[PDB]
Amino acid sequence: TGQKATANHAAELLAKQFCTRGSPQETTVLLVDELDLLWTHKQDIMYNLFDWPTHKEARLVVLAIANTMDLPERIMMNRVSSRLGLTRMCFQPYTYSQLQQILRSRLKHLKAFEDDAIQLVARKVAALSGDARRCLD
Amino acid sequence: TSARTLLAILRLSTALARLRMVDVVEKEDVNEAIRLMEMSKDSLLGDKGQTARTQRPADVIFATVRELVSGGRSVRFSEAEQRCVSRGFTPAQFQAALDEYEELNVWQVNASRTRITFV
């Protein structure tokens, strides 16, 4: 909407709005990044966020973006990992044959680099950690 | 092991040379003399000292390339084979050994596989 309050005046209106009986909503999407910064001592930030789309008239699609996969079983405790699910599909880094193809798409009509230098740069980054940002730099 | 065991080795050299009615010593009297010493020192413990080594068909191939990396960088592919065929290495196994390390990002070749340079 457009109303701005605070962490308590607003946090109380969002709790009573998701449980409103007799009001249609839309299939929204929630995209959050870096979950370790939202961790508090009472664990009342990640636990209540996952219980919102588990209601009747709730169309929230949470896209929890983080780093490693063992976070729910390390930093977060039992209540956060319970009401979540085991639907954690990790993404593996690019292979050696994939780094030479992504760089080829960017240089489709750029006649300025030999074929012996393209595979050499994509070889050192593939052995370090396979980061997609450490190859084009 | 000090100077006390140094004179004990030369003492066992005459224990076997006098059994063949000869006045000279051969290599048999030396290997059999140290055989009883290695068996006695292993009996003082609770196990036997052995070794473990797997004959990899590509372990000595990488060591031969090391002789050209310390001398230069642009090593010719045809020049590196002047030392591999000296001992008796088959060239058929060398073609299958390059992909074992190039896949794991060690070196790199060209399209004709005629240029090799250590990265």
Side-chain angles (χ1 to χ4, degrees):
Chain A
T1 59
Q3 319 106 9
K4 3 244 181 329
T6 175
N8 296 109
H9 304 345
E12 56 181 0
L13 270 302
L14 299 180
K16 59 178 59 60
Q17 196 273 344
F18 295 153
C19 61
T20 300
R21 309 303 179 181
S23 299
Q25 295 81 6
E26 298 182 1
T27 60
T28 59
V29 46
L30 300 180
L31 178 60
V32 294
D33 301 327
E34 199 70 19
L35 299 179
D36 55 355
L37 297 183
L38 288 315
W39 178 86
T40 60
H41 182 268
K42 300 301 180 180
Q43 287 77 214
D44 60 330
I45 301 300
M46 298 68 60
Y47 176 77
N48 49 16
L49 189 144
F50 295 154
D51 300 330
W52 293 345
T54 60
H55 296 172
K56 298 296 298 180
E57 299 178 355
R59 302 177 181 179
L60 301 179
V61 184
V62 181
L63 277 304
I65 308 301
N67 303 119
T68 167
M69 67 178 183
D70 55 354
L71 293 180
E73 48 271 20
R74 282 281 78 92
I75 161 180
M76 279 71 69
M77 46 84 65
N78 181 267
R79 296 183 178 181
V80 185
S81 302
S82 57
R83 280 76 182 271
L84 180 59
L86 300 180
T87 164
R88 292 86 60 89
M89 293 65 61
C90 176
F91 293 158
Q92 301 294 149
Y94 300 91
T95 75
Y96 179 81
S97 60
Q98 296 179 2
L99 294 179
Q100 60 180 1
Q101 183 68 209
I102 299 180
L103 273 61
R104 184 180 181 90
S105 60
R106 300 180 180 270
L107 303 179
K108 188 178 184 300
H109 297 273
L110 285 312
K111 284 79 180 180
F113 303 93
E114 60 180 0
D115 299 0
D116 299 330
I118 299 300
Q119 53 85 18
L120 197 151
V121 179
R123 180 177 300 271
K124 182 60 180 60
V125 61
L128 181 59
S129 60
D131 196 315
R133 273 70 181 180
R134 300 299 300 271
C135 64
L136 81 170
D137 292 340
Chain B
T1 299
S2 59
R4 302 180 181 271
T5 60
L6 178 60
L7 301 180
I9 302 181
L10 301 179
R11 187 185 303 178
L12 300 179
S13 60
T14 60
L16 295 178
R18 301 178 181 179
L19 300 179
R20 283 78 180 180
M21 299 293 101
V22 297
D23 300 330
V24 299
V25 65
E26 59 181 358
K27 298 180 178 299
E28 183 179 358
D29 304 333
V30 183
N31 298 122
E32 297 292 338
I34 60 180
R35 184 259 181 179
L36 300 180
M37 181 180 300
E38 296 290 340
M39 185 60 180
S40 60
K41 61 180 60 180
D42 294 333
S43 60
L44 300 179
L45 300 180
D47 53 353
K48 300 300 180 180
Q50 60 180 0
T51 180
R53 180 60 181 180
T54 302
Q55 289 77 210
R56 182 196 304 179
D59 55 357
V60 298
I61 303 300
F62 183 81
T64 307
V65 190
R66 295 176 54 182
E67 301 292 337
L68 289 315
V69 181
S70 60
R73 278 74 181 180
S74 180
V75 181
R76 183 61 60 90
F77 183 82
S78 180
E79 187 179 0
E81 295 293 336
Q82 300 180 181
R83 303 286 82 90
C84 300
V85 300
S86 61
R87 269 71 66 176
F89 299 152
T90 60
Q93 299 180 0
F94 185 85
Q95 300 293 339
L98 296 180
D99 56 76
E100 299 292 338
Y101 292 157
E102 185 180 0
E103 182 181 357
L104 278 308
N105 301 331
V106 176
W107 54 66
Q108 51 86 16
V109 299
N110 299 21
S112 60
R113 300 179 60 180
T114 59
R115 297 299 181 269
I116 168 180
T117 302
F118 180 81
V119 183

mmCIF file of all heavy atoms in Angstrom, chain A residues 96 116 119 123 126-127, chain B residues 102 105 107-110:
data_model
loop_
_atom_site.group_PDB
_atom_site.id
_atom_site.type_symbol
_atom_site.label_atom_id
_atom_site.label_comp_id
_atom_site.label_asym_id
_atom_site.label_seq_id
_atom_site.Cartn_x
_atom_site.Cartn_y
_atom_site.Cartn_z
ATOM 1 N N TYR A 96 33.499 -27.059 -15.943
ATOM 2 C CA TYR A 96 34.503 -26.543 -16.869
ATOM 3 C C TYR A 96 33.913 -26.325 -18.256
ATOM 4 O O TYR A 96 34.288 -25.377 -18.955
ATOM 5 C CB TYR A 96 35.696 -27.497 -16.933
ATOM 6 C CG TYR A 96 36.789 -27.053 -17.880
ATOM 7 C CD1 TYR A 96 37.731 -26.109 -17.492
ATOM 8 C CD2 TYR A 96 36.883 -27.584 -19.160
ATOM 9 C CE1 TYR A 96 38.732 -25.702 -18.353
ATOM 10 C CE2 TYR A 96 37.881 -27.183 -20.029
ATOM 11 C CZ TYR A 96 38.802 -26.241 -19.620
ATOM 12 O OH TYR A 96 39.797 -25.839 -20.481
ATOM 13 N N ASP A 116 42.875 -20.000 -27.335
ATOM 14 C CA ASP A 116 43.769 -20.541 -26.320
ATOM 15 C C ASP A 116 43.743 -19.722 -25.036
ATOM 16 O O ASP A 116 44.102 -20.236 -23.971
ATOM 17 C CB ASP A 116 45.197 -20.617 -26.863
ATOM 18 C CG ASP A 116 45.311 -21.515 -28.079
ATOM 19 O OD1 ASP A 116 44.525 -22.479 -28.182
ATOM 20 O OD2 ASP A 116 46.187 -21.255 -28.931
ATOM 21 N N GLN A 119 39.968 -20.463 -22.835
ATOM 22 C CA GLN A 119 39.940 -21.665 -22.011
ATOM 23 C C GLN A 119 40.943 -21.607 -20.866
ATOM 24 O O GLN A 119 40.800 -22.360 -19.896
ATOM 25 C CB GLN A 119 40.197 -22.902 -22.877
ATOM 26 C CG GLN A 119 41.460 -22.832 -23.725
ATOM 27 C CD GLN A 119 42.703 -23.275 -22.976
ATOM 28 O OE1 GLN A 119 42.616 -23.936 -21.941
ATOM 29 N NE2 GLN A 119 43.869 -22.911 -23.497
ATOM 30 N N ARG A 123 39.824 -21.812 -16.783
ATOM 31 C CA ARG A 123 40.381 -22.994 -16.139
ATOM 32 C C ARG A 123 40.814 -22.723 -14.703
ATOM 33 O O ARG A 123 40.610 -23.569 -13.826
ATOM 34 C CB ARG A 123 41.568 -23.520 -16.951
ATOM 35 C CG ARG A 123 42.224 -24.761 -16.373
ATOM 36 C CD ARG A 123 43.346 -25.259 -17.268
ATOM 37 N NE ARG A 123 42.867 -25.599 -18.603
ATOM 38 C CZ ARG A 123 42.415 -26.794 -18.954
ATOM 39 N NH1 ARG A 123 42.365 -27.795 -18.090
ATOM 40 N NH2 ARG A 123 42.001 -26.990 -20.203
ATOM 41 N N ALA A 126 37.679 -22.239 -12.490
ATOM 42 C CA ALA A 126 36.947 -23.482 -12.280
ATOM 43 C C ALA A 126 37.588 -24.357 -11.213
ATOM 44 O O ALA A 126 36.897 -25.186 -10.612
ATOM 45 C CB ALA A 126 36.838 -24.259 -13.592
ATOM 46 N N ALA A 127 38.887 -24.195 -10.965
ATOM 47 C CA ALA A 127 39.578 -24.973 -9.948
ATOM 48 C C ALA A 127 39.580 -24.302 -8.581
ATOM 49 O O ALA A 127 39.875 -24.966 -7.582
ATOM 50 C CB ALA A 127 41.021 -25.246 -10.380
ATOM 51 N N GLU B 102 44.184 -32.619 -17.292
ATOM 52 C CA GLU B 102 43.591 -31.445 -17.921
ATOM 53 C C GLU B 102 42.144 -31.252 -17.486
ATOM 54 O O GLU B 102 41.664 -30.114 -17.414
ATOM 55 C CB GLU B 102 43.683 -31.561 -19.444
ATOM 56 C CG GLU B 102 43.204 -30.331 -20.199
ATOM 57 C CD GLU B 102 43.320 -30.489 -21.702
ATOM 58 O OE1 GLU B 102 43.767 -31.563 -22.156
ATOM 59 O OE2 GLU B 102 42.962 -29.538 -22.429
ATOM 60 N N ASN B 105 42.070 -29.404 -14.206
ATOM 61 C CA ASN B 105 42.692 -28.081 -14.291
ATOM 62 C C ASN B 105 44.123 -28.110 -13.743
ATOM 63 O O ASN B 105 44.402 -27.730 -12.604
ATOM 64 C CB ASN B 105 41.841 -27.031 -13.565
ATOM 65 C CG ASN B 105 40.436 -26.928 -14.126
ATOM 66 O OD1 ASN B 105 40.205 -27.194 -15.306
ATOM 67 N ND2 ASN B 105 39.488 -26.541 -13.282
ATOM 68 N N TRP B 107 47.096 -28.268 -16.609
ATOM 69 C CA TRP B 107 47.671 -27.584 -17.758
ATOM 70 C C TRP B 107 46.582 -27.369 -18.810
ATOM 71 O O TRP B 107 45.394 -27.583 -18.559
ATOM 72 C CB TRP B 107 48.861 -28.367 -18.318
ATOM 73 C CG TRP B 107 48.558 -29.801 -18.647
ATOM 74 C CD1 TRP B 107 47.719 -30.260 -19.622
ATOM 75 C CD2 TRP B 107 49.111 -30.962 -18.015
ATOM 76 N NE1 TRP B 107 47.706 -31.634 -19.627
ATOM 77 C CE2 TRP B 107 48.553 -32.088 -18.651
ATOM 78 C CE3 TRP B 107 50.019 -31.157 -16.970
ATOM 79 C CZ2 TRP B 107 48.873 -33.392 -18.276
ATOM 80 C CZ3 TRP B 107 50.335 -32.452 -16.599
ATOM 81 C CH2 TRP B 107 49.764 -33.552 -17.251
ATOM 82 N N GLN B 108 47.001 -26.945 -20.001
ATOM 83 C CA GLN B 108 46.073 -26.700 -21.093
ATOM 84 C C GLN B 108 46.786 -26.933 -22.416
ATOM 85 O O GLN B 108 47.993 -26.703 -22.539
ATOM 86 C CB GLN B 108 45.494 -25.279 -21.030
ATOM 87 C CG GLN B 108 46.533 -24.172 -20.898
ATOM 88 C CD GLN B 108 47.090 -23.720 -22.235
ATOM 89 O OE1 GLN B 108 46.520 -24.009 -23.288
ATOM 90 N NE2 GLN B 108 48.209 -23.006 -22.199
ATOM 91 N N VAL B 109 46.026 -27.399 -23.405
ATOM 92 C CA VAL B 109 46.542 -27.663 -24.739
ATOM 93 C C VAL B 109 45.735 -26.849 -25.746
ATOM 94 O O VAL B 109 44.747 -26.197 -25.406
ATOM 95 C CB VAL B 109 46.508 -29.163 -25.094
ATOM 96 C CG1 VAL B 109 47.369 -29.958 -24.124
ATOM 97 C CG2 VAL B 109 45.077 -29.676 -25.092
ATOM 98 N N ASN B 110 46.173 -26.899 -26.998
ATOM 99 C CA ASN B 110 45.528 -26.184 -28.085
ATOM 100 C C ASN B 110 44.565 -27.125 -28.816
ATOM 101 O O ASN B 110 44.203 -28.189 -28.300
ATOM 102 C CB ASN B 110 46.601 -25.597 -29.010
ATOM 103 C CG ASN B 110 47.513 -24.618 -28.296
ATOM 104 O OD1 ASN B 110 47.619 -24.633 -27.069
ATOM 105 N ND2 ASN B 110 48.177 -23.760 -29.062
#
